[PDB]
Amino acid sequence: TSPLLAPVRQIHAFGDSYSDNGESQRLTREMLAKGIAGAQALPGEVYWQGRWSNGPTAVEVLARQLGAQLADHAVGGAKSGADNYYGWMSAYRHTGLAGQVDAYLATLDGKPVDGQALHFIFVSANDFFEHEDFAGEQPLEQLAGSSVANIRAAVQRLGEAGARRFLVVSSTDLSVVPAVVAGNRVERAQRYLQAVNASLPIQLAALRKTRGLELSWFDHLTFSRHLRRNPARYGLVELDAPCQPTQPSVRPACANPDQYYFWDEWNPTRRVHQLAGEAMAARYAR
Ligand X SMILES: CC(=O)SCC[N+](C)(C)C
**How many chain residues interact with ligand X (CB under 6 A)?**
11
Per-residue contact string for residues 59-78; x = within reach of ligand X by CB under 6 A:
-----------------xx-
Nearest to 146 by CA among 76, 81, 78, 220: 81
Closer to ligand X by Cβ: residue 104 or 266? 266
Q: How far is the CB of 20 from ligand X (least distance, A)?
A: 7
Q: How far is the CB of 43 from ligand X (least distance, A)?
A: 8
What is the footprint of ligand X within residues 105-164 (CB under 6 A)?
A: 125-126, 129
Burial (CB count <10 Å: 0-12, 13-18, 19+), residue 286: exposed
- 16 contacts ligand X (rule: CB under 6 A): yes
Q: β-strand 69-72 against 260-262: which pairing, if any?
A: unpaired
Nearest to 61 by CA among 15, 11, 22: 11
Candidate ranges 10-18, 134-142, 157-165, 216-224; the one touching ligand X (CB under 6 A): 10-18
- 21 contacts ligand X (rule: CB under 6 A): no
User: Does residue 119 contact residue 10 with C-beta atoms inside 8 Å?
Assistant: no
Cα angle, residue 101 at apex, residues 75 and 137 outer, rounded to 5°? 70
117-to-15, 54, 152 alpha-carbon distances in Å: 16, 28, 18
- 18 contacts ligand X (rule: CB under 6 A): yes
Closer to ligand X by Cβ: residue 14 or 85? 85
What is the footprint of ligand X within residues 76-105 (CB under 6 A)?
A: 76-77, 85
Using CB under 6 A, list all residues that contact ligand X. 16-18, 76-77, 85, 125-126, 129, 266-267
